[PDB]
Amino acid sequence: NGMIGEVVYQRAVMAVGSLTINEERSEVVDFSVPFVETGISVMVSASVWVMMFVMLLIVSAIAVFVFEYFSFTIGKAIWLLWGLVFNNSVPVQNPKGTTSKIMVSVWAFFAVIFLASYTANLAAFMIQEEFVDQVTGLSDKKFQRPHDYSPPFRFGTVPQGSTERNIRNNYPYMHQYMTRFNQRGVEDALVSLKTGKLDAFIYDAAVLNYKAGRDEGCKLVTIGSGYIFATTGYGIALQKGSPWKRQIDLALLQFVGDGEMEELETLWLTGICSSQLDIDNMAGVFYMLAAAMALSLITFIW
Amino acid sequence: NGMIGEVVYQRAVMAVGSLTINEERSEVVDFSVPFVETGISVMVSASVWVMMFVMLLIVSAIAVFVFEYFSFTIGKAIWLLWGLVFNNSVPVQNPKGTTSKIMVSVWAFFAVIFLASYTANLAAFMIQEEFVDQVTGLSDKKFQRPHDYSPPFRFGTVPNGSTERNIRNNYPYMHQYMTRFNQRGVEDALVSLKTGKLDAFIYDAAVLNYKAGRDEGCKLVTIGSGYIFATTGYGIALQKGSPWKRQIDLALLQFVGDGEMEELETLWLTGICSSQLDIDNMAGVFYMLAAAMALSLITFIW
Amino acid sequence: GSPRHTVPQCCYGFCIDLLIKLARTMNFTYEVHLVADGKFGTQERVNNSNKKEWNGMMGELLSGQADMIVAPLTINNERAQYIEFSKPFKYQGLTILVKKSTLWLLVGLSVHVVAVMLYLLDRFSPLTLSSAMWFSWGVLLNSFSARILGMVWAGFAMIIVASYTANLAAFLVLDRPEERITGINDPRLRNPSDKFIYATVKQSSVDIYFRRQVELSTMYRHMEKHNYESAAEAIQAVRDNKLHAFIWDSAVLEFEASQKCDLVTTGELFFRSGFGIGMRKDSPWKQNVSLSILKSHENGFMEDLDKTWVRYQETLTFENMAGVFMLVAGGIVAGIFLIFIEIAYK
Amino acid sequence: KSTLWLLVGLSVHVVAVMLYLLDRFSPLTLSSAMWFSWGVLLNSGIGFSARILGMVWAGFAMIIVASYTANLAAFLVLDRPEERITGINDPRLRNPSDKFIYATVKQSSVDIYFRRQVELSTMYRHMEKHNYESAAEAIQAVRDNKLHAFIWDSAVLEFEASQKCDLVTTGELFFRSGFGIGMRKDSPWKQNVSLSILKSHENGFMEDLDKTWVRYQETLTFENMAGVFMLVAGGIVAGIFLIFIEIAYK
Ligand SMILES: *[C@@H]1O[C@H](CO)[C@@H](O)[C@H](O)[C@H]1NC(C)=O
Ligand SMILES: *[C@@H]1O[C@H](CO)[C@@H](O)[C@H](O)[C@H]1NC(C)=O
Ligand SMILES: *[C@@H]1O[C@H](CO)[C@@H](O)[C@H](O)[C@H]1NC(C)=O
Ligand SMILES: *[C@@H]1O[C@H](CO)[C@@H](O)[C@H](O)[C@H]1NC(C)=O
Ligand SMILES: *[C@@H]1O[C@H](CO)[C@@H](O)[C@H](O)[C@H]1NC(C)=O
Questions:
Q1: Of residues A48, A119, D232, A277, the one with CA closest to residue C158
Q2: Residue C99 phi/psi, 5° resolution?
Q3: Which family does this protein fall into (chains A, B)?
Q4: Which of A249, A245, A251 is nearest to A13 (CA)?
């Protein structure tokens, strides 16, 4: 049906338009050399602690040497040490040794440069924004049971296409999961991905790449960059035994060798492209307070 | 002689190469329409403190009122308050009133968010890339006399050029000063500006823009983009009475309004191109502390 | 807009003074008037007899109603294909005019739990209750066994305020919504919608310039919705955000930016051309006018006219601490109410 | 892929002494009040209008340290050493230099691809003095920084990026071509194996070959402040030596 029937029944001489290539199409007609990378695609929406512990032991030992030198500076001065890290204005101890004043001045400059470097660390961590994809590839755990995760979601394709046939070559059960999740249109599926009527979508590579490029606001995000996909290529459909095959192939491979194809891809394809959330840091906060109440339960035996 | 001598005396048809347009050339030749904006150019290398002070007096008055409820920190509460604005924690006083402690905690929250907003203000000031222009036009008083200002500087042109004729028809005294400061080569003046054997240079706009767009380090920056300048254009010079004028002008204006001229500008022009210093703020620091010790010496009269 | 109203008026300005200048140059008289309807002029068929005509200043020029256009006419290809142009007196391009806690409260409830569990830790294994309460007042904002967990919480408080400083500097310093369009090369404007409302002056040179180029055709099918008569109506429509962008020349939008500080241009700049004088066919008023314009360019009289009109022009930290400022000003009443409680209890 | 702080230090060495003189002039006292000034410009550390000057000095403490938070954000956060090239549209390779060492295999497909494109003639002037015979020699030369760029296919370069961290590629991708099977003239093996290759593309056998070799790959804050960390770890000896000097005084 469509173009392939017009080539087989020979009312069409050649189909120069965009066309996917798979096994049975290569059986029934003959194609050209490829000219664009078009697979398929899916659319969705340590030692520092050790050395600071070592330096804390060094400061505690020098505090012991201050108490042996020249009034609770034996082991409680760590309450001065890890209290002046944070500048809390909580009274701890008034030091009576020159060694204590010099060491606390060194530790105060060290705490100032440590908090400055930690602000730089938070800046560099804030610039590094995450960009992850939950679905890895076609062998996803989501692609075996969507109810195994707590929302059972849905993902569709185009009907009656070569992509569905390649899925049925891969997995008939994937087609059985997809059969209740079919839809009609390309931009209909796009709007269904906009308004939450659809969560993911599976089609060829460059079409969804261009639709992600024209996505208003970089909202719908692709998965991967052509790694776990079918990796086929568009060609030019000709009749079997046509004399124009070698000439069109040489003309296309001449058209690649000057950057003119890259100029047309520049002209027609444009694949372009913050609040209070610290759930990793807050998870660390909850884990350290659980460790704190565990240590208090350990110290409750005395 | 030159381009005009080869055009007018009929050893050539048209002058395609880069050439300025002035009055006597337009007397002897009939130019085309311009195609690039090429004039001339010169190359070289409030309300926080008052209301916060009023709120500081409000906090001191509430501290006096808490003393009226209930030791000697009546007028010494300011030395606590503005000393703990900056949170360097000078040892001042430990407050006794509960409402005073709540007020100090609220003002300390205000001080923490104030210093955070001040760090954000310093980061936003660190964002902007500021530029300086020691000469802001051809009508500078520096150009009037190198004895008018304390360093006697220098400015370069090219000999036997249209810029010299424009100076002679516009500023004869400036031509008299340029007579002291002549040189020969364009790249000679380039090397003199890089090494430091020349201070200023006077030429056309786009030539110096392209020389700035391909230099490593990009020391040489112009003054604006042709705003206090001659603002003429490069075109094609033909013989007076040639029938090619209309056709050449229509071909050029067809070449303008399609982006192909912009493509050639991309092909032949390049559109490319700090440390820790706060010594102005440091001089302000030293002068304000000298004014503060002067105020202390004024108050020492009692 | 006019049923019947045609009057003499006082006209002045930039090209008016240029006209006075070249009237001083060679001696002639004149008759300054304006266009019948405010259009530059485009090559357009009248829909009887299937015939192209011109309107506006060009339609009054070719009909003999006008003989010299001293006006900001944009020189392009097709308008030069019929009549003659002098050399341009103004050089510019084209550009675009536009118009330019909760988890902390959870941590506060957490330290409300922390103060109680630390005081019970001090109570179980050995004015003191109010002393530990005031210690909690000194800990939860940071203005011996329980003090270990207290200084652990002080570390929590510093790392929370460090994250708060970091993401406030993020939210108001580093990241930014793309308020800029980046000129004609914006991919979202290539296939626009009802959220990007932008157009041009009706029957201007911008219409022909965007009708020619084949890679700007789709925007030409969008900007034909809201074609406006004058640029003042475009300023008025973008002034109430009925539009979202506008395509116009450089120096006019720079003058409007010097007028209104919210009307801001953008980065890109294309179609480098020039305003010149609209002229007739082969006439003895052709060489003199171009020589006089070039004589006005070689001296600073162009810069003097820039001084008349073109060159002629016309943090504070109270943004997110405005509500905090109001809360500090309102907490004084609560502190006085606590003073009333401390009076009334004894 | 400092001096201003020293001037501030000499300044506060003037400031502490002159503020103690001004506090004596406006009524172990000397060392204790100097240590009080040490606690003024720093955190507390120790337990009348001259204090006003001191609290004014406290404000300058913030305009030190917040400024110390400012300039490092200009020193490590926003700035970046220009080690990227960003592909073929770099004018550094369009207009080359003597140190811009870019090459490929001598008499390869890249050489003919740049020899046909006449606008790429200038780079064609360079590699004829610089090309190698094998890409492993190029990896060994760029490891010793004898190269500075290397026009090459993406698979080998991304595999060596998975091998070594310093081997870093770029973003632009030109002449998007294919690796296939070189065949002879008219023969049925041009057909059969081709369908077999397509039989490899339809299933996950190309995916398994990617998993075997292609797909499978192979803060700390010690950039320059580690010298300051060594200074903190080493100044303890000189401090305790000064404490022995203070013992020799007493
Ligand atoms: C300018 O023209 C005169 C004509 O004699 C010539 O002597 C002189 O060398 C020229 N200077 C340059 C380098 O343009
Ligand atoms: C001004 O007009 C007079 C009278 O027509 C004429 O003689 C004179 O040449 C004119 N001036 C010039 C030079 O245009
Ligand atoms: C086209 O012809 C009709 C005839 O009624 C008339 O309205 C007008 O001349 C043209 N259309 C416009 C602009 O209304
Ligand atoms: C300017 O006007 C006069 C008017 O006759 C004419 O001769 C010529 O066009 C110009 N001047 C010259 C070159 O005589
Ligand atoms: C594949 O090779 C076999 C060898 O017997 C041959 O029968 C066949 O022609 C080839 N493929 C097809 C189906 O044409």
A1: A119
A2: -105, 100
A3: Belongs to the glutamate-gated ion channel (TC 1.A.10.1) family. NR2A/GRIN2A subfamily.
A4: A245
Q: B181 CB contacts (<8 Å, ≥6 apart)?
A: B154, B155, B156, B157
* Residues of A whose CB is below 8 A from B89: 87, 89
B224 backbone dihedrals φ, ψ, rounded to 5°: 75, -150
Do the Cβ atoms of B87 and A119 come within 8 Å?
Answer: no
Q: Is B136 annotated as a binding residue?
A: no
How far, in Å, CA of D72 to CA of D66, rounded? 10
| Residue B233 CB partners (closer than 8 Å, separation 6+) | B21, B34, B35, B36, B37, B38, C87, C88, C91, C274
Pairing of strands C245-249, C198-199: parallel
E strands within chain A? 14-15, 40-44, 155-156, 200-204, 221-222, 237-238
Q: How far is CA A133 from the centre of its chain?
A: 4
Phi-psi region of C142 (alpha: psi -120 to 50; beta: other; left: phi over 0): left
- Residues 6 or more apart whose CB falls under 8 angstroms from that of A240 comprise A29, A30
Burial of A95 (0-12, 13-18, 19+ CB in 10 A): buried
CA distances from A293 to A280, A286, C152, D229 (A): 20, 11, 11, 33
D32 lines ligand 5 (CB under 6 A): no
Distances (CA, A) of C268 to A146, B224, B270, C273: 48, 16, 15, 15
Angle, helices C102-124/C128-140, rounded to nearest 10 degrees: 150
SS3 C107: helix
By residue count, chain C amounts to 346
Calculate Rg over the CA atoms of chain B: 33
After which residue numbers is chain A interrupted with C–N beyond 2.5 angstroms?
A: 45, 70, 273
Beta strands C270-278 and C69-74 are: antiparallel
Residues linked to residue A43 through DSSP beta bridges, in sequence order: A201, A222
Whether D163 lines ligand 5, by a CB cut-off of 6 Å, is: no
Q: Which residues line ligand 1 (CB under 6 A)?
A: B 159-160, 184
C128 lines ligand 2 (CB under 6 A): no
The CA-atom distances, in angstroms, between D154 and each of A142, C246, D7, D137 are 31, 43, 52, 17
Contact residues for D201 (Cβ-Cβ < 8 A; gap 6+)? A230, A231, A232
d(CA B228, CA C303): 7
Instruction: Provide the experimental method for this PDB entry.
Output: cryo-EM
B41, with CB counted inside 10 A (0-12, 13-18, 19+), is: buried
Which two three-digit tokens encode residue D92? Answer: 């550094």
Give the separation between CA D226 and CA D220, rounded to whole angstroms: 11
Known binding residues of A are 18, 20, 25, 162-163, 204
Report the 10 Å Cβ neighbour count for B105: 16
- Declared resolution, Å: 5.3
State the Cα–Cα distance between residues B119 and B112, nearest whole angstrom.
11
CB atoms within 10 A of CB D20: 19
Amino acid in position D56: V
Work out the end-to-end distance of chain A between its first and last CA atoms, rounded to an integer number of angstroms.
85
CA distance D241 to D243: 5
- Kindly state the DSSP code that residue A227 receives in the 8-state scheme: S
Q: What is the DSSP letter of C75?
A: P
B92 lies within 8 A of chain A by CB? no
Structure token pair of residue C257 = 């930016």
Element (H, E) at C335: helix C321-345
Q: Among the atoms of ligand 1, which is closest to the Cα of residue B159?
A: 14
3-state helix, strand, coil split of chain C in percent (to 5) is 50, 10, 35
Which of A107, A52, A100 shows the shortest CA–CA distance to A83?
Answer: A107
Do you know the residue count of chain A? 302
